[PDB]
Symmetry: D2
Subunit: 385 residues, 4 copies
């Protein structure tokens, strides 16, 4: 189970670079030179890396230092062949963003947030990024009076609309992906789930420029079924990017390596991604636990990719099994894919077999055979067939 | 704090009529004649009632018994002046719906679900219903292989599209409201939150015919902020109906009387509903606990309305307080309502005060004063000012 | 992976016998004759069955019908060789228990609950039960004023103390096991977790007669780590019985088949049960989903046992792997098992290497190597080594 | 509603002193001199302050600087009259504690944790602390193989037993209080709830020296009823100290000011504390949100005390209302307080009115009248009577 760049595995600089600074504790690891991360990730078989503006260029850098950091970074890309498919803006670390970026109550902060974003979009295009992610981590509230949510959604739409005006006026080939999260670091965050972000996008001036970047652990922090949410995003045509990691239920955002947390949900996610032909990056937004030293960092990152590849093989074996294919017919998955009333409304109204002569007791007595199917899926996952 | 029909308080027949049958226990109350509920609710000051088809007409009734039940019901409406603003279909109780109604794997069940719905839409229009609610309680899955969610969303869209074809071909003035719920009775339910339903509606043939019917306890079963979700629905123009009740966090659907559960969320909900001028029914979907006899049923129903009216007075006092209005300015709620860049993109790019000469340290040091505002809201809620 | 009675797999009559009646729906399966369940479970390789008094003897049966039901049941045991290791009382279904059994506010109900329990203890001893389980499903509250919890704990202690007086005065060799649950069907239930029950037992007159019967899904309804809780119960010497099933996070009590829900928690549970030498029944308290017919019932029950046996093999392979054993030493699990200060308090105070000359920076820089260990456990679970 | 030192309100130095450093953001406030906090808290009417060793004496201070910091602190106590009722050890911030303090896998860290604790116990006694709190924030695991929980409980017992040997050998009049928390910063923390800590204490050599320090938000992070848990702790005689704050359901540990979060739970908590005559400190472990400047810090701290005092008045008015007292009799709270069978086991067995002649249908038809009682409590809380 060895990854190749063909597998399109990508990592954020801030992931393997996380120093272990948590709400109750100081850092446990020194900082990583972004050049060193690129080289170690290329050795592990990764396809590319992603970045926040502030990961690459330390905040408040002069134009000249800015240029040094980019040229060093670009040289590591050329030496390794690594790509940069995605980039994003840090609108959450600096104290100025304590009430948000695009939806801060203070107008001058909102204008500053836009300028900081536009500057990094230029840089992301230069480095070849296809997707630009927006995580509004500080957009939200701890108390109800602090934020009028209708006004804040007006400001949020205004920000995204101007960003789309900029990329089209510049003739850039880049698309935006909104990343939802229900809470943390704010008490409640705006657009808290995949569904709220999809709904919001349909009100933008240019909906076709925006999609979602869902993260495994984020939807699970609301107790939701992550493969169900990904299916709705694919159904809407909006799965532009995806963040893979692990999460053990409803609690703080753990960012465990992918495959940890809910293992069966990971199995059904890979099954969905592979059968639907998702072709974007398989990005890992995770944190090697602060118990680890640098050898444990690279072991954890390696494990993300290995676990995806094992699950890919198990899901492919599950769908190819003739015994599973007959189980799928036994549970009538084939009939789910068939139109309910392609004969049309009027034919439906006149069809006595649909109501007057429908035998409800006969239909009700039919078992769905879902438990035998699910045990076949379990046996496959576990390699017990 | 006495309700009048002017307050537009409505109750489902299945609410005060719930016999106490729960997963682990038999009924504790006899059944209520729907005529008797209408009269007792009219005495308490309610504006109207709602119904499932199977609440009013017991399942499998002949055409003749059907007509008797409707005429008895209509007579109670005329005697009391009570209205019927909303109606809905039971697609969850009969065993035939064990894998869903509109998204059952079996095609013939899906056709039967549509015919059962269309029959009740005719009856709801006859009784003057403005809104027709759809709660897909059985649309979902306990296991991942059992339901292809993309296919099921195709079937769900097909069902709602045909329903909209029917109402427009009949020239009916009625609109649909989808009611989301994350889980129970299925392990995960499709369209699990307000956001997922709003997103789904934008893919229907005739989006303008569909809105949402959110329920307090349902969004709280996912840990979400219910007033935030209602604000997004109002922002989208889709709050057609609302279900009020109480819920104590993430657990089974409690359906406590309104005001129980999360009291401060109820305060902020009423504040939002009243300041935005929501003018639809204030519907209570609740269950008097099975510890209660019939006197406790009517006490619980009375309490729903009383608690709304107390919170309405407290929220109105909060917004009218000049001290609160200056606190709102101190926290810059006025600046949130102001466009970020009405001067436009190009003016923003050239505005040096927005980036090159923005003093981030000065902006960052400004306190938001959110805690003083929130304590003013607490004092108001508690009547301690 | 075929079960034998040697594996000590047991099932409740109410499990495979559940008709599918849930809060929102009627039954989907006919009732099962307890004789028929015993025979079908013996065919699947189960070791035995358990019962509530009301599962075996329908409520309100005359003495004569009572005797018929027992003799029929006993004959099925003798024909099959099946055992009855555990029994329990239904103090939750009849409306009389709507405010609880042992802690009902009405004194006469509490006395009735005790008499109903004592009658079934006699029957359980006759049938050879070793353990008598108490699940206080109705002991709790929906509102805060309804129950003084100190008084209710007094009543709860009084009930359990009298039950222990009865078994010792009768010279019975049977022990009690309290089954915790955080909520449902009450809004909050008393003794909501394994920890609260262990604490409560230490206040009984005869603590040695009482232990816990924890259930997988119940502790997970509070977001807790079920293997951690089982370890604390083993540590205290109180794991008398255990209920195995599956649960997908914090929501209504799903009672999925064992191995469904949180798969990695099931792996770590079996690892703990097997390495600690738990020798009691492996009882399954689960519900075949109501989507299923009777063939799906037996497939689901079969799956409970299969999944335990697959996980037993994987956990045994994990602990026997020399590479894992060196990984365990690398993470210092061996040092965790060693006393911190067997040299004693005074030696500790004088040990300069423990404080004055302790190199905190050297200790802090040591990686725990926990991620490599956990990936070895994942590879083992998945059969990828 | 003005606090006096008589009200016994206390604050941690780390509370009003929190700089706003969260997992995703830098500090938003400068550090507070502990002398300045003591003076500002004395002005607000607080009774006293608490501290971690590392709050008062910066880590790694020489003996001489140590003495300066204590003398400065003591002078502020003498100038203000403020007390120090409680103290605790920081065994979570320094990287050396990344796998725990008392249960770290590395033996030498465990010995260091004990020495660091013993040093601060000496200082707490000098300053007059009555209670010494232990929060094992790093005792736990992110993965299942990393910690054998039985071994870790052995080490945990060994640590607490040696601490009790030290205080008794020194003739100190101080008691220990264990503070539970379910998770964060570890994935699961040992002794995760009030119940698990009470159970654990009964296995210590000297149980009478140990009690619990429960925190509002911590039990709510597991979805538990905090007033129920406090009642069990009072029932066991182990409520030595309590931490008051606010929490909005199951998510990261918010540490909102007291009265925020679940308002009705706060009402029932104060009702319980006041009616049971809890006489220890009313300690606030909270965090002024990082949106706030220093004026907002003191407003938030003031609000903690105000909200306790408003709720104290409302709960006292509720219990003194004759209409409530008759409602309590109507719901049979008086009968809950009465022994179930003071006549004894044999009298119970022979009492035909308890079983043979018990009218279950008559008892079952009695309403509990719990909803009318709860609405009286709501009206009282809201000042609507
Ligand atoms: Mg995350
Ligand atoms: Mg992410
Ligand atoms: Mg509900
Ligand atoms: Mg509803
Ligand atoms: Mg259960
Ligand atoms: Mg059970
Ligand atoms: Mg806390
Ligand atoms: Mg605390």
């Amino acid at each position: 189970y060895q990854p190749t760049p063909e597998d399109r595995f990508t990592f954020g600089l801030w992931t393997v670079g996380w120093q272990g600074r948590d709400p109750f504790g100081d850092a446990t690891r020194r900082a990583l030179d972004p050049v060193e991360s690129v080289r170690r990730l290329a050795e592990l078989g990764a396809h590319g890396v992603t970045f926040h503006d502030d990961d690459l260029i330390p905040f408040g850098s002069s134009d000249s230092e800015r240029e040094e950091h980019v040229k060093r970074f670009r040289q590591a890309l050329d030496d390794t062949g690594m790509k940069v498919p995605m980039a994003t803006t840090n609108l959450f670390t600096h104290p100025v963003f304590k009430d948000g970026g695009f939806t801060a109550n203070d107008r001058d902060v909102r204008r500053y947030a836009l300028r900081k974003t536009i500057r990094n979009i230029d840089l992301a295009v230069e480095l070849g990024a296809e997707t630009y992610v927006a995580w509004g981590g500080r957009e939200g509230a701890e108390s109800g009076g602090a934020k009028d949510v209708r006004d804040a959604l007006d400001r949020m739409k205004e920000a995204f609309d101007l960003l789309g005006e900029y990329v089209t006026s510049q003739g850039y080939d880049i698309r935006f992906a909104i990343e939802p999260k229900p809470n943390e670091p704010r008490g409640d965050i705006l657009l808290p789930t995949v569904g709220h972000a999809l709904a919001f996008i349909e009100r933008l001036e240019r909906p076709e420029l925006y999609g979602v970047n869902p993260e495994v652990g984020h939807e699970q922090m609301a107790g939701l079924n992550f493969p169900h949410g990904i299916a709705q995003a694919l159904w809407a045509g909006k799965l532009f990017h995806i963040d893979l990691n692990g999460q053990n239920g409803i609690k703080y955002d753990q960012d465990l390596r992918f495959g940890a947390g809910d293992l069966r949900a990971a199995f059904w996610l890979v099954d969905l991604l592979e059968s639907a032909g998702y072709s974007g990056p398989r990005h890992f937004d995770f944190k090697p636990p602060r118990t680890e030293d640098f050898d444990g960092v690279w072991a954890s990152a390696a494990g993300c990719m290995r676990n995806y590849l094992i699950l890919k093989e198990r899901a492919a074996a599950f769908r190819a099994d003739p015994e599973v294919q007959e189980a799928l017919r036994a549970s009538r998955l084939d009939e789910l894919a068939r139109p309910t009333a392609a004969d049309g409304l009027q034919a439906l109204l006149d069809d006595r077999s649909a109501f007057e002569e429908f035998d409800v007791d006969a239909a009700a007595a039919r078992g769905m055979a879902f438990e035998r199917l699910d045990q076949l899926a379990m046996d496959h996952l576990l390699g017990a067939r």
